[PDB]
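Forwarding the complex inputs:
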Amino acid sequence: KTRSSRAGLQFPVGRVHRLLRKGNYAERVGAGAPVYLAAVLEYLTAEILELAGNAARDNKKTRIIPRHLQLAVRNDEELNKLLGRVTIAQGGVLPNIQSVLLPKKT
Amino acid sequence: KVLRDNIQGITKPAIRRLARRGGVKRISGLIYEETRGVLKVFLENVIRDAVTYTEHAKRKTVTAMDVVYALKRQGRTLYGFG
Amino acid sequence: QNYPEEADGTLDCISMALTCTFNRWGTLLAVGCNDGRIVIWDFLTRGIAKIISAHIHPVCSLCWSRDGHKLVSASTDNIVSQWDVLSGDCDQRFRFPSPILKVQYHPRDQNKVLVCPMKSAPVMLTLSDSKHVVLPVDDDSDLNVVASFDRRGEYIYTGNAKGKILVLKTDSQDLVASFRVTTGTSNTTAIKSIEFARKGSCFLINTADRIIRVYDGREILTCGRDGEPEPMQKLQDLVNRTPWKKCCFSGDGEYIVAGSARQHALYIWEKSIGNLVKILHGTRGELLLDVAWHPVRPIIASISSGVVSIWAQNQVENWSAFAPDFKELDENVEYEERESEEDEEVDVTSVDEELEDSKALLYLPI
Amino acid sequence: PHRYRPGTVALREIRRYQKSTELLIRKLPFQRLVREIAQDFKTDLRFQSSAVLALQEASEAYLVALFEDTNLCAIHAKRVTILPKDIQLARRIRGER
Amino acid sequence: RYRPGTVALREIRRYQKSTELLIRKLPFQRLVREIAQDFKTDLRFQSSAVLALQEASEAYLVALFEDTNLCAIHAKRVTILPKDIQLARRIRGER
Amino acid sequence: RRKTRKESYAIYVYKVLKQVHPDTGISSKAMSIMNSFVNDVFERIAGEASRLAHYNKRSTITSREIQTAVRLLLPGELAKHAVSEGTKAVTCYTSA
Amino acid sequence: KTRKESYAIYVYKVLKQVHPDTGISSKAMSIMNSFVNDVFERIAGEASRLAHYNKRSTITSREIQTAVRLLLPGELAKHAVSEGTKAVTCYTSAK
DNA sequence: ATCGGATGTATATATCTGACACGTGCCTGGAGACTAGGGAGTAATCCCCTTGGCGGTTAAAACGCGGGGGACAGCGCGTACGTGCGTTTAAGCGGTGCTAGAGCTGTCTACGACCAATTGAGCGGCCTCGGCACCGGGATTCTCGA
DNA sequence: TCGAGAATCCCGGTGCCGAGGCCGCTCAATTGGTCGTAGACAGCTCTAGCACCGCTTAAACGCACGTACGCGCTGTCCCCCGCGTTTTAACCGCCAAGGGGATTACTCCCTAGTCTCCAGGCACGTGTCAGATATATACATCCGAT
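Prediction (whole assembly, nine chains):
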């Protein structure tokens, strides 16, 4: 019988518990730790992937290229606070031009 | 309580002396307010982590060792308290 | 509608405020100040009604009469007095050998008040002749017992301090039904209190096994003398283990609300599904005293440490309510135009559920 | 004494201070300030004399560092005066915008 | 065409939209080979591994440039200068 | 030669994406980057919680310590949302 | 009243070995305790994570070698690794 | 450029006091002996792939010129600041009482590791079909000098 | 305020390899007990952060002012760049190989764990002097005079 459906989450819980048990983070763990971790990873993954899909439909492309993920992570501010010193392969950079460097004439 | 006073508790000569220990001479008169601001925004995070740490330990007093623990969590380490 | 989703500030007409309760649909607030006075605030109108100089020692509980003419107060100095809502003076004065926990008025019998003395059986004091009738209990007579009416007050339910719950009649006192709570796995458990609703005859029970349970006031007289415990949902908090102090029922009959002590975690569920739906974000530092929703409209209002915090549904009607034939909406479709372009002599004279907790008759415009 | 030229006594003040080892902000105002700011996160907390002491030094440390950085960028500005925009420049370039 | 400074904006925007690498594969691979031979001889590289390093470089490098940029703005000029690069490297706290 | 079996967080995040937007495809590169991200955050939180548990002379890892860790690590109202979601998940799990 | 652990006697003897004329105050004791602890957790954690990298269940001396070479700066790392190798050899030769 | 005068700068002389360094006790860890059992290395292997190399070219680099736009030096200026002094004021020791809280200890009960086997979640192989790359050309928008 | 030329966007129009989905074949995740135990509750002890006040003065307050320089403006001149050219090896796609990285199997030996006793390092007194504290002084420096 399964264990992920007991809480209705999607990320595995048995896998998390086994990997944390063999990860020697401590010697003895409770029962709510694996389900709680599965839940928080679920929430963070959903938070990122919703913006990923929004960026995918921005350019009208079904497949999500990593550029979309880069834009979605960078344009948000809380992510930029949490993903401070992290880069992305093939990610690129969001467009930006300094304000005072903008020529004009009549 | 929340009081607008005691924020100016660092009166001008204290910042003067701190600037001197930094090694500057000519400081404009409009530096004091943003110094207060940056000091407050810095102190916010450390005091918040300290109170969370002391709360998790089920006691309502804060020591110094948990303070240096929070400081090391941010990245700035203190030596001389254990 | 649904659970409250907005946040309201505080309602502090005076600095101190200990207890609060709604009358029938949240009309007036019964503040028992910690100075020996009884203050009445106005709800849904944000005002005050009357201040009563009761006595010296402050009080700790409040309730109003079925006819709304009395202000009963479970005093901390054993002053079982019937303060008048109208004049503010004392109508009936009496003294009890034990203080009172839970004061209530039967919506069908205001003569017999609800008293919960400690280390002694509950006593109904009749306001017509100042006579005290002891509620017959079972086994011990020195336990921390709490007595409470049903929806209609027709049966009275008492909870003891060893694991025994008693069922008897509010007026005939025919103790013919008992109940034994489950003994966990090895050790027994006492009962802290019970709390009822206004529809469905359900009631929560708060015990010493750190777990809040729920029963219905229909399976004890049906089973007979004593049967096997069988709750619907053994709700509890399994991440912090917060103890439970005060918790009431919903203003609709389908929700369940539970209150913390210092953690500012106000939990809510529904009777249909025991799954958490929302949690309250309270600012830490104060102890919760009383909780009781609007008995009709979904809202939460918790008193704590002399102040009150309300999480509500603040509403203002949309700008598009100028006239039924006038709307202020946005659309990008072409307008759909219209497609369909007596004499009598009679004067005009015409001008949860409802119970009998009305007729406060207390309102002073000046 | 006599009306000295600006910055002249500043140099000897620097020399007296930069070699010194002491606390520059007073004690009572700072402990009162931290007790005031602690209220928002949680009320009715008790501090330890050893604790709060520690704190100020760390803060001073950080604050001192800031001036250092600002001074250098001030020299990069072809001026001796310190201006607010340089503080924001240092804060942003350090990595904690 | 003419009007210098106009073509720069078009180029910089065009490249800002694009997200490809900027260093030819073979020269960078040979340079990594040389700097590895400096440490130890006869090291077999994974074609995936080299690529890896490559990307990280630009990341680091581009960040540096941006910082120097604002430093030039602090000096009342548009052109960036070597001195600003040492400014950024020292002020970052990585000397 | 000898084929090997490897574990990646590939199926679960794909199911999440379908649950959210059942109309958009995903790339293998995005799959690997999401796998790296989830491994990263998992290790970060677990290690911080473990070293906190050692800090308190506790030989166990309860669920409370993890929520303390996510209060410290996660900034802003995202922390409140995540901790509320975790409490919801555990409460819905226990009585089953 | 109770039993508490510290590094006081050992650092004192090390001081007396090299400068048998200079005293220290309690603040020096506390700061040296903090320094030696801090470096101990840093190097020990690095060694643990190295051991976990290569799916190995043990931590031996050569793991400490790799950790010290990786973490400390160059010349001090060379001195430290030389002295440690000398110590381990003289320990193993005379067990 | 050169010299005299007020003034903070670092130095030597009593001394005294509380923190520094030393001698005692003994109990809790660590070193001495022994075991078994599970990690590990070491022989062997064989197919994946990374190094090496070759033909074609063109996209990219390399080099020279014309000039205009921006870096750089200077000059006035008037204005914001550092210096100086008389005055009030809250910091800084000083010393007092205690309750509120931290901290240590006996306890005993709900809760996590061991383990056996299952058996379905889950990982790998093969088409495959369409999302997307490649391409050819017309419609669409920007810019600067007459 | 208005053209010529010059770029980019988009509408087809077409061809191709990557995400996908099904089939087959495993291996570790539950379930249920089972067993030992780590921490939770209640009590008692002690000790110090806090409320409180007294008196003293180092320092903050704020005015006065005389000038150092931040800044706006000018002129200057010099070199970065864009446009054009010629020039060439990065890149593409194709070959072939050997070697070594990852896998299998195995015997052997390092170590967790237990038991064992004894010894050394922290709590605790206790004597004593290193440097702060206040006094008088030669000296180097900012300022002012020529």
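Residues 2-87 of chain A form a domain with the Histone, subunit A fold (CATH 1.10.20.10).
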